[PDB]
Each structure stands twice: as structure tokens, then as C-alpha cells.
CSV table of all heavy atoms in Angstrom, one decimal:
chain,number,residue,atom,x,y,z
A,1461,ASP,N,54.3,72.0,144.6
A,1461,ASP,CA,53.7,72.3,143.2
A,1461,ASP,C,52.4,71.7,143.1
A,1461,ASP,O,51.4,72.3,142.6
A,1461,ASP,CB,54.7,71.9,142.1
A,1461,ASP,CG,55.8,72.9,141.8
A,1461,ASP,OD1,55.8,74.0,142.5
A,1461,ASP,OD2,56.7,72.8,140.9
A,1462,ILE,N,52.3,70.4,143.5
A,1462,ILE,CA,51.0,69.7,143.5
A,1462,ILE,C,50.0,70.6,144.3
A,1462,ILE,O,48.8,70.7,144.0
A,1462,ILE,CB,51.1,68.4,144.1
A,1462,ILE,CG1,51.7,67.4,143.2
A,1462,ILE,CG2,49.7,67.9,144.4
A,1462,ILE,CD1,52.1,66.1,143.9
A,1463,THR,N,50.5,71.2,145.4
A,1463,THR,CA,49.6,71.8,146.3
A,1463,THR,C,49.1,73.1,145.6
A,1463,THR,O,47.9,73.4,145.7
A,1463,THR,CB,50.3,72.2,147.6
A,1463,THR,OG1,50.8,71.1,148.3
A,1463,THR,CG2,49.4,72.9,148.6
A,1464,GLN,N,50.0,73.8,144.9
A,1464,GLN,CA,49.5,75.0,144.3
A,1464,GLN,C,48.5,74.8,143.2
A,1464,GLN,O,47.5,75.5,143.1
A,1464,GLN,CB,50.7,75.9,143.8
A,1464,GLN,CG,51.5,76.5,145.0
A,1464,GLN,CD,53.0,76.8,144.6
A,1464,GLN,OE1,53.2,77.9,144.1
A,1464,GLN,NE2,53.9,75.8,144.7
A,1465,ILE,N,48.8,73.8,142.4
A,1465,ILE,CA,47.8,73.5,141.3
A,1465,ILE,C,46.5,73.2,141.9
A,1465,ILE,O,45.5,73.8,141.6
A,1465,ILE,CB,48.3,72.3,140.5
A,1465,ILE,CG1,49.6,72.7,139.8
A,1465,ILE,CG2,47.2,71.9,139.6
A,1465,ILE,CD1,50.3,71.5,139.2
A,1466,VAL,N,46.5,72.3,142.9
A,1466,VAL,CA,45.2,71.7,143.2
A,1466,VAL,C,44.5,72.9,143.9
A,1466,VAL,O,43.3,72.9,143.7
A,1466,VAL,CB,45.2,71.0,144.5
A,1466,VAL,CG1,44.3,71.9,145.5
A,1466,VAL,CG2,44.5,69.8,144.2
A,1467,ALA,N,45.2,73.5,144.8
A,1467,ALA,CA,44.6,74.4,145.7
A,1467,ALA,C,44.3,75.8,145.1
A,1467,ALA,O,43.3,76.4,145.4
A,1467,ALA,CB,45.4,74.6,146.9
A,1468,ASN,N,45.2,76.3,144.2
A,1468,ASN,CA,45.0,77.6,143.7
A,1468,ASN,C,44.0,77.7,142.4
A,1468,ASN,O,43.3,78.7,142.2
A,1468,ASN,CB,46.3,78.3,143.4
A,1468,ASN,CG,47.0,78.7,144.6
A,1468,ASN,OD1,46.4,79.1,145.6
A,1468,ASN,ND2,48.4,78.7,144.6
A,1469,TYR,N,44.0,76.6,141.7
A,1469,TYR,CA,43.3,76.4,140.4
A,1469,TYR,C,42.1,75.4,140.5
A,1469,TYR,O,40.9,75.8,140.5
A,1469,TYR,CB,44.2,76.1,139.3
A,1469,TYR,CG,45.2,77.2,139.2
A,1469,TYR,CD1,46.4,77.1,140.0
A,1469,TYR,CD2,45.0,78.4,138.6
A,1469,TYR,CE1,47.3,78.1,140.0
A,1469,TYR,CE2,45.9,79.4,138.6
A,1469,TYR,CZ,47.1,79.3,139.4
A,1469,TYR,OH,48.0,80.3,139.5
A,1470,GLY,N,42.4,74.1,140.7
A,1470,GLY,CA,41.4,73.0,140.7
A,1470,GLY,C,41.7,72.0,139.7
A,1470,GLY,O,42.3,72.3,138.6
A,1471,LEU,N,41.3,70.7,139.9
A,1471,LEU,CA,41.3,69.8,138.8
A,1471,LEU,C,39.9,69.3,138.4
A,1471,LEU,O,39.0,69.2,139.3
A,1471,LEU,CB,42.2,68.6,139.2
A,1471,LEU,CG,43.7,68.8,139.5
A,1471,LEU,CD1,44.3,67.4,139.9
A,1471,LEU,CD2,44.4,69.4,138.3
A,1472,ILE,N,39.8,69.1,137.1
A,1472,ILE,CA,38.7,68.4,136.5
A,1472,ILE,C,39.2,67.2,135.8
A,1472,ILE,O,39.7,67.3,134.7
A,1472,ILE,CB,37.9,69.3,135.6
A,1472,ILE,CG1,37.5,70.6,136.4
A,1472,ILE,CG2,36.6,68.6,135.2
A,1472,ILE,CD1,36.8,71.5,135.5
A,1473,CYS,N,39.0,66.0,136.5
A,1473,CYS,CA,39.5,64.7,136.0
A,1473,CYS,C,38.4,64.0,135.3
A,1473,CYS,O,37.5,63.4,136.0
A,1473,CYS,CB,39.9,64.0,137.3
A,1473,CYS,SG,40.9,62.5,136.9
A,1474,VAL,N,38.4,63.9,134.0
A,1474,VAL,CA,37.4,63.1,133.3
A,1474,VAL,C,38.0,61.8,133.0
A,1474,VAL,O,39.1,61.7,132.5
A,1474,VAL,CB,37.1,63.7,131.9
A,1474,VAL,CG1,36.2,62.8,131.1
A,1474,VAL,CG2,36.4,65.1,132.0
A,1475,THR,N,37.3,60.7,133.3
A,1475,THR,CA,37.9,59.4,133.1
A,1475,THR,C,36.8,58.3,133.1
A,1475,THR,O,35.7,58.5,133.6
A,1475,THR,CB,39.0,59.1,134.2
A,1475,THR,OG1,39.2,57.7,134.3
A,1475,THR,CG2,38.4,59.4,135.6
A,1476,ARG,N,37.2,57.1,132.5
A,1476,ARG,CA,36.5,55.9,132.4
A,1476,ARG,C,36.7,55.0,133.6
A,1476,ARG,O,36.2,53.9,133.6
A,1476,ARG,CB,36.9,55.2,131.2
A,1476,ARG,CG,35.7,54.8,130.2
A,1476,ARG,CD,36.0,53.6,129.4
A,1476,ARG,NE,35.8,52.3,130.1
A,1476,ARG,CZ,36.4,51.1,129.7
A,1476,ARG,NH1,37.2,51.1,128.6
A,1476,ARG,NH2,36.1,50.0,130.4
A,1477,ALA,N,37.5,55.5,134.6
A,1477,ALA,CA,37.9,54.7,135.8
A,1477,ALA,C,37.9,55.4,137.1
A,1477,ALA,O,38.9,55.5,137.8
A,1477,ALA,CB,39.4,54.1,135.5
A,1478,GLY,N,36.8,56.0,137.4
A,1478,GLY,CA,36.8,57.2,138.3
A,1478,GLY,C,37.0,56.6,139.6
A,1478,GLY,O,37.5,57.2,140.6
A,1479,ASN,N,36.6,55.4,139.6
A,1479,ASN,CA,36.9,54.5,140.7
A,1479,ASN,C,38.4,54.4,141.1
A,1479,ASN,O,38.7,54.7,142.3
A,1479,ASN,CB,36.1,53.3,140.4
A,1479,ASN,CG,34.8,53.7,139.8
A,1479,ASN,OD1,34.2,53.0,139.0
A,1479,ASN,ND2,34.3,55.0,140.1
A,1480,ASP,N,39.3,54.2,140.1
A,1480,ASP,CA,40.8,54.5,140.3
A,1480,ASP,C,41.0,56.0,140.7
A,1480,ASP,O,41.6,56.3,141.7
A,1480,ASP,CB,41.6,54.2,139.1
A,1480,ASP,CG,41.6,52.7,138.7
A,1480,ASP,OD1,41.2,51.9,139.6
A,1480,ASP,OD2,41.9,52.3,137.6
A,1481,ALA,N,40.3,56.9,140.0
A,1481,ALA,CA,40.6,58.3,140.3
A,1481,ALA,C,40.3,58.6,141.8
A,1481,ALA,O,41.2,59.1,142.5
A,1481,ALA,CB,39.7,59.2,139.5
A,1482,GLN,N,39.2,58.2,142.4
A,1482,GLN,CA,38.9,58.5,143.8
A,1482,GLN,C,39.9,57.8,144.7
A,1482,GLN,O,40.2,58.4,145.8
A,1482,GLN,CB,37.5,57.9,144.2
A,1482,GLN,CG,36.4,58.1,143.3
A,1482,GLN,CD,35.8,59.5,143.4
A,1482,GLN,OE1,36.3,60.3,144.2
A,1482,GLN,NE2,34.7,59.7,142.8
A,1483,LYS,N,40.4,56.7,144.4
A,1483,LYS,CA,41.4,56.0,145.2
A,1483,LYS,C,42.7,56.8,145.2
A,1483,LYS,O,43.2,57.0,146.3
A,1483,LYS,CB,41.6,54.6,144.6
A,1483,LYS,CG,42.7,53.9,145.3
A,1483,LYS,CD,42.6,52.4,145.0
A,1483,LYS,CE,42.5,51.6,146.3
A,1483,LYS,NZ,43.9,51.3,146.9
A,1484,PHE,N,43.2,57.3,144.1
A,1484,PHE,CA,44.4,58.1,144.2
A,1484,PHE,C,44.1,59.3,145.1
A,1484,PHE,O,45.0,59.7,145.9
A,1484,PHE,CB,44.9,58.6,142.9
A,1484,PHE,CG,45.3,57.6,141.9
A,1484,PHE,CD1,44.6,57.6,140.7
A,1484,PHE,CD2,46.2,56.6,142.1
A,1484,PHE,CE1,44.8,56.7,139.7
A,1484,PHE,CE2,46.5,55.7,141.1
A,1484,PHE,CZ,45.8,55.7,139.9
A,1485,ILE,N,43.0,59.9,145.0
A,1485,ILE,CA,42.7,61.0,145.9
A,1485,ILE,C,42.8,60.6,147.4
A,1485,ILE,O,43.4,61.2,148.2
A,1485,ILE,CB,41.4,61.7,145.5
A,1485,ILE,CG1,41.7,62.4,144.2
A,1485,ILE,CG2,41.0,62.8,146.5
A,1485,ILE,CD1,40.4,62.9,143.4
A,1486,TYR,N,42.3,59.4,147.7
A,1486,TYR,CA,42.2,59.0,149.1
A,1486,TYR,C,43.6,58.6,149.6
A,1486,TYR,O,43.9,58.9,150.7
A,1486,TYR,CB,41.2,57.9,149.2
A,1486,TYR,CG,41.5,57.0,150.4
A,1486,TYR,CD1,41.0,57.4,151.7
A,1486,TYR,CD2,42.2,55.8,150.3
A,1486,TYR,CE1,41.3,56.6,152.8
A,1486,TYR,CE2,42.5,55.1,151.4
A,1486,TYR,CZ,42.1,55.5,152.7
A,1486,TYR,OH,42.3,54.8,153.8
A,1487,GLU,N,44.4,58.1,148.7
A,1487,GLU,CA,45.8,57.7,149.0
A,1487,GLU,C,46.8,58.9,149.2
A,1487,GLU,O,47.9,58.6,149.6
A,1487,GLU,CB,46.3,56.7,148.1
A,1487,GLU,CG,45.6,55.3,148.2
A,1487,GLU,CD,46.1,54.3,147.2
A,1487,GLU,OE1,46.4,54.7,146.0
A,1487,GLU,OE2,46.1,53.1,147.6
A,1488,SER,N,46.5,60.1,148.8
A,1488,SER,CA,47.5,61.2,148.9
A,1488,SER,C,46.9,62.3,149.8
A,1488,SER,O,45.9,62.8,149.6
A,1488,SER,CB,47.8,61.8,147.5
A,1488,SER,OG,47.9,63.2,147.7
A,1489,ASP,N,47.7,62.6,150.8
A,1489,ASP,CA,47.3,63.7,151.8
A,1489,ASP,C,47.1,65.0,151.1
A,1489,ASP,O,46.2,65.7,151.4
A,1489,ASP,CB,48.3,63.8,152.9
A,1489,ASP,CG,48.6,62.4,153.4
A,1489,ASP,OD1,49.2,61.7,152.6
A,1489,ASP,OD2,48.3,62.0,154.5
A,1490,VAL,N,47.9,65.3,150.1
A,1490,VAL,CA,47.9,66.6,149.5
A,1490,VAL,C,46.6,66.6,148.7
A,1490,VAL,O,45.8,67.5,148.8
A,1490,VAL,CB,49.1,66.8,148.6
A,1490,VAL,CG1,48.9,68.3,148.1
A,1490,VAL,CG2,50.4,66.7,149.3
A,1491,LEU,N,46.4,65.5,147.9
A,1491,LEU,CA,45.1,65.5,147.2
A,1491,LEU,C,43.9,65.5,148.1
A,1491,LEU,O,42.9,66.3,147.9
A,1491,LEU,CB,45.0,64.4,146.2
A,1491,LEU,CG,46.0,64.4,145.0
A,1491,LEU,CD1,45.6,63.2,144.0
A,1491,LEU,CD2,46.1,65.8,144.4
A,1492,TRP,N,43.9,64.6,149.1
A,1492,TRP,CA,42.7,64.5,150.0
A,1492,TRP,C,42.5,65.9,150.6
A,1492,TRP,O,41.4,66.4,150.7
A,1492,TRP,CB,42.9,63.4,151.1
A,1492,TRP,CG,41.7,63.4,152.0
A,1492,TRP,CD1,41.5,64.0,153.1
A,1492,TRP,CD2,40.5,62.6,151.8
A,1492,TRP,NE1,40.3,63.7,153.7
A,1492,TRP,CE2,39.6,62.9,152.8
A,1492,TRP,CE3,40.0,61.7,150.8
A,1492,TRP,CZ2,38.3,62.3,153.0
A,1492,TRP,CZ3,38.7,61.2,150.9
A,1492,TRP,CH2,37.9,61.4,152.0
A,1493,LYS,N,43.6,66.5,151.0
A,1493,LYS,CA,43.3,67.8,151.7
A,1493,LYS,C,42.5,68.7,150.8
A,1493,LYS,O,41.7,69.5,151.2
A,1493,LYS,CB,44.6,68.5,152.2
A,1493,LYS,CG,44.4,69.6,153.2
A,1493,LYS,CD,45.8,70.1,153.8
A,1493,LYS,CE,45.6,71.5,154.4
A,1493,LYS,NZ,46.9,72.3,154.5
A,1494,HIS,N,42.7,68.6,149.5
A,1494,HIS,CA,42.2,69.7,148.7
A,1494,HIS,C,41.1,69.2,147.8
A,1494,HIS,O,40.7,69.8,146.9
A,1494,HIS,CB,43.3,70.4,147.9
A,1494,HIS,CG,44.2,71.3,148.8
A,1494,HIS,ND1,45.5,70.9,149.1
A,1494,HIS,CD2,44.0,72.5,149.4
A,1494,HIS,CE1,46.1,71.8,149.8
A,1494,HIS,NE2,45.2,72.8,150.0
């Protein structure tokens, strides 16, 4: 389900901590892949 959202649609993550944001992306294969 994570894969379909990210991959078929896309995320726009607005945040005051984008530094945390990028880290979660780097820590998850599914997110990093997409």
C-alpha cells in the first residue's frame, strides 16, 4: 500500500523538520526506491 501511494501518486511533504523527513526516506527501502 505504501508502494502504491508513493509510486502511483506521489508525496508532497511540507514540514519544519525536513531534515527528519529526508532521514525517514533514507531509512525505508520502499520510500528510498521511489
Side-chain angles (χ1 to χ4, degrees):
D1461 275 1
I1462 286 169
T1463 293
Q1464 290 156 88
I1465 292 167
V1466 112
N1468 287 327
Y1469 305 88
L1471 299 180
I1472 306 179
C1473 193
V1474 175
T1475 161
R1476 232 207 81 199
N1479 325 147
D1480 297 341
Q1482 315 278 8
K1483 174 163 237 275
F1484 300 119
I1485 291 166
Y1486 154 83
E1487 292 178 326
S1488 139
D1489 313 62
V1490 184
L1491 299 188
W1492 179 270
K1493 197 173 156 201
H1494 286 106

